Design brief:
Elements: E1 36-44, E2 48-55, E3 60-67, H1 72-84, E4 94-99, E5 106-111, H2 127-146, E6 149-150, E7 159-162, E8 167-170, E9 177-178, H3 197-200, H4 209-224, H5 235-246, H6 248-257, H7 264-270, H8 292-301, H9 312-316
Antiparallel strand pairs: 1-2, 2-3, 3-5, 4-5, 6-9, 7-8
Helix pairs in contact: 2-4, 4-8
Bound molecules: ligand 1KP (2 copies) and chloride ion.
Length: about 325
């Protein structure tokens, strides 16, 4: 299988001192859990439970993510990633790290964030707001990509939004990792529906461009008002749903170019499928959310070859965002 290197931000970690990305060596400076009191539970998941809390020394509202038991190196990874990304635009801001008195697990203290995520609104935004928030998500991905980090779990549930203040934050960096050219990565990342083809075919030498595919899936879901857009019933079917849209021609080309192996009995199931036109998924209901710019943008995101997808910066420069960058910040 042919090796691959990111087209952008290729060597950003290489040009930084090892301390930046060598998270196993990172020495955690713990804060004091006694300075925070938990107010109410906001949610619970595989790896954490999330609480509203208060910094008692100054009454600041914060959000606390208490990690469930996990290998230390993954905890160190998320912490170091979060610390390197502090004050990046639209990325959740880590304010402190404490140990849970009870479980003894690390708990991450974040700037306050609204408890509404980008799945609760985003089947109802205007055309203008979809462009607006899409651009805000792009700032966070360009930023984290520029800092040598792949998020690897982009999806609506991982973007919190405060629509009334038009603020958004990309959250849940528990699956993120540092990009190093030549490194092979776990392909068991992302929710099925936002998994890029490279993950579906077990191609391990992937990069930031994985996030750009997931972003395209969110965009498709929003403008076509279908959630999810690629609704696979298992990992194989996810690729089949994709191939039914992008066609099999470009898929087989992609597999060849990286010398990817495809279980030949899966190939029999995929067969051949025509590349469909995006216009195919337009209906009276979603008409107003679609435009030529939107479809061109979507087309340049949802590409099999990861090397061919728009970079975050290229996407920020796409005509889809031409006007929305002139936003006059009305609340
Ligand atoms: C606090 C308290 C208990 C647990 C945690 Cl994680 C925080 Cl931040 C209460 N002291
Ligand atoms: C919330 C949730 C997860 C993360 C954050 Cl930062 C907030 Cl405000 C919901 N659980
Ligand atoms: Cl992993």
């Amino acid at each position: 299988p042919v090796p691959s290197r990111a087209r952008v931000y290729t060597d950003v970690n290489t040009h930084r001192p090892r301390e930046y990305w060598d998270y196993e060596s990172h020495v955690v400076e713990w804060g004091n859990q006694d300075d925070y009191q938990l107010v109410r539970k906001l949610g619970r998941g595989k790896y954490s439970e999330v609480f509203e809390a208060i910094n008692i020394t100054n009454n600041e509202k914060v959000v606390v993510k208490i990690l469930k038991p996990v290998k230390k190196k993954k905890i160190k990874r998320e912490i170091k990633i979060l610390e390197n990304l502090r004050g990046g635009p639209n990325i959740i801001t880590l304010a402190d790290i404490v140990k849970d008195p009870v479980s003894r697990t690390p708990a991450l203290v974040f700037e306050h964030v609204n408890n509404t995520d980008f799945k609760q609104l985003y089947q109802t935004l205007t055309d203008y707001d979809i462009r607006f928030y899409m651009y805000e998500i792009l700032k966070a991905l360009d930023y984290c990509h520029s800092m040598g980090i792949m998020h690897r779990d982009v999806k609506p549930h991982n973007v919190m939004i405060d629509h009334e203040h038009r603020k958004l934050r990309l959250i849940d960096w528990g699956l993120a990792e540092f990009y190093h050219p030549g490194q092979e990565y776990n392909v068991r990342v992302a929710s099925r529906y936002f998994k890029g083809p490279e993950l579906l075919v077990d191609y391990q030498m992937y990069d930031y461009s994985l996030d750009m595919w997931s972003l395209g899936c969110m965009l498709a879901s929003m403008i076509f008002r279908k959630e999810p857009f690629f609704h696979g019933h298992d990992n194989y079917d996810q690729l089949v749903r994709i191939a039914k849209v992008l066609g099999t021609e470009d898929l087989y080309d992609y597999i060849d170019k990286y010398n990817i192996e495809l279980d030949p009995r899966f190939n029999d199931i995929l067969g051949r499928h025509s590349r469909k036109r995006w216009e195919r998924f337009v209906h009276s209901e979603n008409q107003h959310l679609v435009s030529p710019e939107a479809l061109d943008f979507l087309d340049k995101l949802l590409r099999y070859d990861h090397q061919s997808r728009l970079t975050a910066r290229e996407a920020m420069e796409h005509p889809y965002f031409y006007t929305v960058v002139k936003d006059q910040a009305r609340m």
